[PDB]
Amino acid sequence: EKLGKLQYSLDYDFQNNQLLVGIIQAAELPALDMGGTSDPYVKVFLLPDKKKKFETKVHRKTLNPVFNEQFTFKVPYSELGGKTLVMAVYDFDRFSKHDIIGEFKVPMNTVDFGHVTEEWRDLQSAEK
Numbered sequence: 001e002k003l004g005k006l007q008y009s010l011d012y013d014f015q016n017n018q019l020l021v022g023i024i025q026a027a028e029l030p031a032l033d034m035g036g037t038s039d040p041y042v043k044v045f046l047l048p049d050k051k052k053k054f055e056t057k058v059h060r061k062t063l064n065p066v067f068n069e070q071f072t073f074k075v076p077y078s079e080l081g082g083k084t085l086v087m088a089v090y091d092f093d094r095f096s097k098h099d100i101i102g103e104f105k106v107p108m109n110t111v112d113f114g115h116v117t118e119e120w121r122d123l124q125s126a127e128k
Contacts, residue, residue, distance in 0.1 A: 001125025003102030019073035025066030032091035038063030043088035044071040080108040100128040
């Protein structure tokens with residue numbers, strides 16, 4: 001844990017009233033596969049905030065992958081106010097015990113979805 005980072009650019013399509021979380025890449029998180037690599041997968045959902053578990057495409061034998069991967073957040077900015085953005089780097093290792101790699105906790109009230117949210121966001125240690 002203390003995962004490294006995942007830089008993103010999250011945008012709003014407001015006339016479907018949904019947020020968009022198009023990250024970039026996560027970099028150099030611990031390997032859960034038999035090749036000193038991982039098969040990254042990002043869990044992205046909220047509570048009654050929008051409990052929509054979306055999923056990154058699995059990046060085989062690399063935990064430092066760059067997708068620019070859209071986390072579909074079907075909640076308006078006005079609706080953001082209550083909402084809690086949790087994001088979870090999870091390794092789908094298809095065989096062994098799946099280790100949760102990392103996570104980040106992102107409260108809506110701190111995230112400005114006026115236009116495009118571009119900042120380099122770090123994967124913090126998850127203990128799940």
